[PDB]
Amino acid sequence: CFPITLKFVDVCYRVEERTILSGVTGMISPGEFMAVLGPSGSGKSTLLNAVAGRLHGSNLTGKILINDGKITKQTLKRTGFVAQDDLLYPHLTVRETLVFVALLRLPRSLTRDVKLRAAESVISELGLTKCENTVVGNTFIRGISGGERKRVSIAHELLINPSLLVLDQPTSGLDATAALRLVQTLAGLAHGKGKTVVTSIHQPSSRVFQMFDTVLLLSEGKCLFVGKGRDAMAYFESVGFSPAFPMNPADFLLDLANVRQTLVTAYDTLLAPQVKTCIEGITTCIATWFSQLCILLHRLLKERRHESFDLLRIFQVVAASILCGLMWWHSDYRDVHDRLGLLFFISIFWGVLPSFNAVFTFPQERAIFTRERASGMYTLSSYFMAHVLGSLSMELVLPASFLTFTYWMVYLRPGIVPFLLTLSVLLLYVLASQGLGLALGAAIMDAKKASTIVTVTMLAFVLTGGYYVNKVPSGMVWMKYVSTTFYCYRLLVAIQYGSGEEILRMLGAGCRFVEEEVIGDVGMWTSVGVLFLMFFGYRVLAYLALRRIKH
């Protein structure tokens, strides 16, 4: 195994400017059980958060050390953290969640059956058998109780067996017997494997307290006692405070922490020097990536079973296509002005809808993305590829259904080849718009601040598309080459009306209008290549934005 020793010296926290912690010092060796006790608001989820490395900035003072070294990402890979909040996927069951975690983080030198057995044994040990076939749920949908979600979160980190384990009040919400059994399991995990377990209990009983190895006492940002658990009562008796009647020691510790100045001075004069002196190949990556991508795809699809399946989308897009076809019923080839508006409207529709839809993806899952990123479940590239692969399963269906009706109701230029070319061009444009929407949604954390920005950006793209204005100023004409709607409209008009040499045949001012609204100054291959470039670049920018966010 990998031993870990943990040290924190003169750690103080200042944010008004109030002090949350000050003058806390201590260590925990491997194979030692650490408790962080204190009254409510004394500071118990901030020391552990800083211990786990989840806190940064200039508000942190003192020195924190792991193996006489600074906190590193490789060290953080072996750290398990169980916080108070239960950030769980609502549409999965307990079995699926724990099996996914076990497949993801267990070593890749064992068969599937061994990992499944490990997950099942972990489920059975924690007493989760009864509700192992139920939806986890969340605050909105009806799922499991609050006492089982804590055990699920416990098993989320216990499945991997991290060398360093930090728990943030894991016994809150369970009865005496269940909490005692969980504490006994933690004690067996700490003593029987030489690991480093730090926990912050709040309401411990005498039986639970008796098996605790070391206890730290915090009183509103000040340390009061540290060392062996059995010596707390003796030390406080020697300092001048004695129980009037026999009672549980932890209650006395909390009462003393809840007079305070004398205890602080006595501790600072007695235990300060003793504590201050005692302290001094390549194919494997490919295989793992593909397996992880498969697992992520399965999880994403399982989540999307009850969300992505929406008959309303098809029943509305079909109605919109029928309305569009009826409005342009059998318009002939002669009126080029009437049929040029239909292509621009199609471009507006399929540049507005996917871009607006794609902005809701990353911010929706932001709540659990940080939680899964902090532990180090998988590299962000696998998640990005999983998302882009999952989206395309449903996204591409709508434009096909739209065109299948619109192209034949309006009776555009007959031919299978123009049909296929137009469909491919429209799908590429939709992909580019979705990529732009995803990038803009990833750039800004909130899902609603980015909504207005996306709306204004795509409306500016529509304005620059070239259909509205004709007398563009000479010095402000370059913006036409940036908008994604321009290339799609040019490709559609070039496909439908060729190069314009045919149009002048029937027509024999009109020639200038046809020349300016048909030929243009951009080629087909250039338009396709630039569309592909935009589709690559938007995903690249979204990946960079996702890389930027790290706590």
Add this chain to the structure above:
Amino acid sequence: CFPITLKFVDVCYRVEERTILSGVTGMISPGEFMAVLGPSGSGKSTLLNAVAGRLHGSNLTGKILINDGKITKQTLKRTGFVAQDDLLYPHLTVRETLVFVALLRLPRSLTRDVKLRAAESVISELGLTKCENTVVGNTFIRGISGGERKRVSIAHELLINPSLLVLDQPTSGLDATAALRLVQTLAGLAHGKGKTVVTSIHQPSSRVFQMFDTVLLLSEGKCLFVGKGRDAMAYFESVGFSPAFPMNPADFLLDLANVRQTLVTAYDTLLAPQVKTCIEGITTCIATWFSQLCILLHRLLKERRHESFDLLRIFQVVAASILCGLMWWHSDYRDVHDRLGLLFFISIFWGVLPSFNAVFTFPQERAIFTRERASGMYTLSSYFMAHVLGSLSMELVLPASFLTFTYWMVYLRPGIVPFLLTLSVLLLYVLASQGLGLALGAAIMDAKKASTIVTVTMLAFVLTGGYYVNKVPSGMVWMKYVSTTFYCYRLLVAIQYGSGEEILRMLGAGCRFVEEEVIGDVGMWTSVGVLFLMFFGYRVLAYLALRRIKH
């Protein structure tokens, strides 16, 4: 005070089809303390919700009675329910939240100072003085700890002094001293005022257990013991179960609840018949409404001061206006085709933006709206008026800033009268679009499907705006009068270019074009009246949708 006798008889709950509760009978008299004890997953919280009237449907059997009568809304007005989850406004402080509650619910016959004193005394009693000047926060922003949020939620209902008080594990997350103080406060509130208090503790100490009047024991959906707390040990000693060593009685109760069949049979044979036999002016409303509206407005603006105060919105709207003005730089009055498109684009912009920005208002606050509505803090009409009044403070600024630049960069028809008329028309149109967006967002409380539905509806409105198609089918002409963009565009063109008599001096095919795209078949007054009608109707439909949702 108003006494309440609470009864539940043969309450069973069945949802796979797995039973959560079955054979639960009992009663609590005024001035009596009720406990719901049991292991994790025993269904105590479901029973607590059922007794509080928060559960409906055919899944509930048995009979529930209050004062020998069914649960009514007037009775629900006297009930204070606190659950495990803490639904609090993240951008408010403790003082502001509790003061708002005290002003909203305390009787309208006392001075402001008395209510403020009640709030301050409640704050001081619960030990919240130290952090009473901090932001409450949520999972995203840094606020108060999890141990103080529970006390805030407890005070949220303690400020009212309801006759019936139901608590769902209120002591989870606090130390021994804080838990003891809260339990003593609850005991004094129950015995000293003749109230009806039902709670479900999970990890009680002997001292806490000794002051509990009555205790009910649940074992995975089955009752095990009910009656006085002091007789809990004697009954199980008589039935044939005795602890080997002296220990806390609640631990023994949980162990027995955690063998089970014999206890169930003994309880069904012994204590069943005994319990079964024991079971058997006008101006005031106006004055209050305006004050409630004032408080709601203050809370809304306090919340929006940290979110709606975005300079990006103006910095982007002014940029879009500058781009629009540069695109149409000093276009003369001769080209009607180049100038009608600008008005249509303005209509598209100011229909798309507010409608899409008004779809997330209600779903965002849905999380707390149900919690506030269940208690009965205020009528829905006050909340609706508060929301519509708060929105207009910020919404109306954007169109004015847009027009101030666009109308004079393009140099439209000079004159203060056309400027004011078109500004009023644009403001009415943006209000109507915002109303439509609000109604659609209220109809479906999800922010995912509503966005797509609103986008498709607005795109259909744009298509039916009348700028794209010219050969409309005879049987496809009525829905022109349904879209709001049609009225907005007609008003804009009528204001800018008059009745068309003016255009024909220069006009002299073109005459038909001017007649069809200038005069139309709808009047100015009709357009304004129909716009006002739509503005009223959308808010009416939104109010109906908000009224519909009741758990």
